[PDB]
Design a protein around this ligand. Sequence first.
Ligand SMILES: [Ca+2]
Ligand SMILES: [Ca+2]
Lengths: 618, 618
Amino acid sequence: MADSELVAQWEKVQIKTFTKWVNMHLAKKGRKINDVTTDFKNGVELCALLEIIGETTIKCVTNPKMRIQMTENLDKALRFIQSRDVKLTGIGPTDIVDGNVKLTLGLVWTLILRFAISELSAEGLSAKQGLLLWCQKKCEPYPVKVENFSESFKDGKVFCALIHRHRPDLLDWETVGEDDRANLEKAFDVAEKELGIPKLLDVDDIVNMPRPDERSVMTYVAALYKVFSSNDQVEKAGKRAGNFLDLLRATEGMVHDYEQRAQALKENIEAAINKMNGVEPSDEYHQVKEQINETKNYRKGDKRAFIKEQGDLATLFGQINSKLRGMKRPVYVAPEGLDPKSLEGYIANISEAERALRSKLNTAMRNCLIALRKAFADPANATDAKINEYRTFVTDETSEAPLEEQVATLKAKLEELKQVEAQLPPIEEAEKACGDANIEDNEYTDVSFDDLQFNYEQTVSMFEKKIVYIEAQINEASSGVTAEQMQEFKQSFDAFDGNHDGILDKLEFRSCLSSMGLIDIDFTGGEDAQYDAIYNNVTKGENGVSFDNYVQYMKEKNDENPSPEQLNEIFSTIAAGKDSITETDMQKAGMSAEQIEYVKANLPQKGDGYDYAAWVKT
Amino acid sequence: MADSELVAQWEKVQIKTFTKWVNMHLAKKGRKINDVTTDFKNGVELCALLEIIGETTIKCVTNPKMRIQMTENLDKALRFIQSRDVKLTGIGPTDIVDGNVKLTLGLVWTLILRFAISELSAEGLSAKQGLLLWCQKKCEPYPVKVENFSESFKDGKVFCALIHRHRPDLLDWETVGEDDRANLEKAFDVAEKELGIPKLLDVDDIVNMPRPDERSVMTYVAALYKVFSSNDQVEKAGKRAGNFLDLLRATEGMVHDYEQRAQALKENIEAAINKMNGVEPSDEYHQVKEQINETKNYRKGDKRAFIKEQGDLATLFGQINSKLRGMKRPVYVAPEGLDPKSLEGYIANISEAERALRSKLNTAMRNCLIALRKAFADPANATDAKINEYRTFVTDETSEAPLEEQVATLKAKLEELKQVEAQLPPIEEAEKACGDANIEDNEYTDVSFDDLQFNYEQTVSMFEKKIVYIEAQINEASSGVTAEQMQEFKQSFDAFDGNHDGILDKLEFRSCLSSMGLIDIDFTGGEDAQYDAIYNNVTKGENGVSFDNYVQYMKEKNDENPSPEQLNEIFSTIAAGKDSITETDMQKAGMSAEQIEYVKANLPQKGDGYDYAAWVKT
Ligand SMILES: [Ca+2]
Ligand SMILES: [Ca+2]
């Protein structure tokens, strides 16, 4: 009969915990019982416990005098119990009054089930088993087995499981799983101070006993169910889902922003490649420079922005994926061809498009450059060569032809070279072009434009000179001008003829004459009127100065000059016979001091006089 | 006796002309004679003729009464004649009184010689012959023979010769040489109106006679000699030499000016060639451009001036030579090596020096150019190639080596490439150089500097990424971070780390957190003080943010996130058992409208509720 001590010990525990359960409710009305087996005998404490948990007015006798009134009290109380789905055919009021142990404890038992765990029953499952299923489901991750209401809860790691499964903030879990005194005390303490569940079970007489009482344990779990089921626990569970949903919702915002922007970037890179593939490399320099310059704006602007953006997105996609890795949720997969690895390839492309464009533009500029240099070099080299061929021709004097023919030949060859004059202003333009295009190296020619202009002018003037000199040779008999002499007239005349019309202007002629100093008249209140008349005298009409008129004048002025014999007479007459010319003779003759000085300077002296034999020598 | 009519005829002419000579002198005192043979008989007219030509007072009887007084008169007159060198031993006063023809005419003759042509006699030459020599010398260019005083002067072209030889302004010469009446009348007329010589010879009785009288002709020539000998004729001859000397003197000025200037030009061209031959073609671009530019100043300035000056001088030398050709004088020969043909060669030279210099400068610029392009192209091509070799290496995943070794290998190869970073700023400088030197074509490379910088940065970042990911693989067991997961942390952290010190600044960290939105706290009067404390919480000291600290925080934040089973409970508790979550449950649970919207948006609906089987699925 050892299986008799265990039955008793349990009764001692089941009386403690069923008492601890009644006054937990009675307390809300200030009432209290000491022992369920003895304090329910008068009926009063049961009726008042029923009125608090059931919320109905039962007005029983507070001080029952006779066993009849105690019984009277219980019938009113038993009517209330029976009305709710409870079976009470077995028990009568007579024995609950007597204070019968197991029937009182069986009645306290029936009420508990109705008022704490009746909700659990599920068409094929008793109150005990539906509560057991509720324990079982809430303990799936935990290293406990929940198999009965005695053996399973002895350990007490199942009591801790029920609090951590519902509220992980109140008792941390991996600090559970060794001591049986500890984990229980911690759990009963947690339900007492923070859940408001009174310590209905003693910590010491569950650890001391081989198996705890099944009914006592069930009472506590039911109380635990009501607190965790409580409205406030639902509210706590609201805030928790809130926190989790909100993070996903901010993360929705993050995936939307990335999507809008990733698309944008893909589109923009695409736009750029169309532009780049589209542009066609110019033949013209200022255009190609402009095309080159264009690329530099992109490299400077957009290109920079496109790299940065792809960066930022690779950032965003990574960050977003971290957050879902963090939430234990599945990773974000970006729409086909908007993953960042895809995105990076797009950058690759426009980099590939740029490199192909500028290289294409590079050869353009190179080619353009070459063409520009040859646009001045090939003509100028053709032209330098032409003038030179004609230079050599006028330089050649091996001809054995008649002079009149040589003149005709010359003027004929002159025309050709004169024709060249028009090609000069195009080549000047082509050199200037090379200048604008910034080239300070030619490489195809040494020659310059100014060299061409100067060489041409010289060769043209060279022809003009040889023409006149052979024309004056032809004319020597006819007009008494030394061929040689004529050159000098042509030479002088040309060089004042400011235009090249071979006629001197009234202004233009005066300077020529003024140069040679033939106009003795100077200043005198500007007494150049004589010139008005001299101009007219020279030009018979003529409204300008003829080369022939010019020459006429000069021949006329030359005729005024005495011959050397005629010169001799003048001196003879000065000296009155003697060849020696004394200073006194000249002074008496009236000559200016300066004239005398020249005579002395220029004439060899014999004795007291100056001989003039050498001047007459010819 | 025909040679008797000629002797008479002559006497008739010699009386006319000897009379015409006496009263020419007598006129100056108002006195006059009609005939020398009859009016000298009284002596008075002779004495008075003697007193005018001799300038001495003889006071003879004006009205001689007796043949004795007439004779008396002549003795006084004959004393005066004899005193001057004259021979008069033959003639007496008695016969001159009688009126003897040939002796009177012989006495008139002797006086004429003394008072008009005595000057001519020259120790071996009679008065007649010295006068004849004087005629002979003054008629050297003329087509006359002067052989006697009769036959030679008959023609009269010798009388014209004497006036043109002395004064060519009064009777022009080539309008002489046909008519004998004409040329004589013109000459006698010229001496009458402009010389003041009276027509002592009749024009008609020299043309009518076979030979004119020798003595009559001589009388006129003597008179002609005195007028041409006259002071005023000397003065006229002064002005004439003046005019000729002065022209030479102005011409002296012209040869001096040319000489000073021709020298100058020769010297200056010389100076210029020394400069040109002296300059040495630079290796450096800005210098060579400067050397090129220098030439352009000369071509623009001096060169122009040197051509002009040589022109002007060729003008001056020609003009001067014309004037001496004009003066019948010998031509000016310029000092050896200052003739204009010489001068033109000097211009040739400096043109030759210029062409050699700029060509030499041209190849310089060409070379300079090439060097400059290769100074960027060869390094950049070396560098593009290096980075790419390292790119391929990090791209290679064929390795079968241990991970720890692969990490060591990687960081080791990373150092090398990190070293390159310093070569980048030199190549940027070398590209910029090419830019200043105005080259928009390269030709030796397609590559750019920005391409190098970007490719480098990408490859360096590529290494950093693969290092951390293999390091997180190695660490997975130790620290419960998905290798993959760690990247995201590194990825995010790096991208806010504004410097590259792998530590985030207080400012720098806040942005990172702010980005992810983990800091719920915002605005509230700037209530970021919590952050002060959160920063400190993250960084234990630490005065910055550790990558390990960063990661710690994130693991900490990740741990706060419930598992999918833990998520299930929260929903179970909301729904109080049923899997279907109604809107009302969530509203009663207290959840925000937005949370509810997300639930509906994200969760498949069964009946009246929203299932959460898929979220728990994992
Ligand atoms: Ca003109
Ligand atoms: Ca930093």
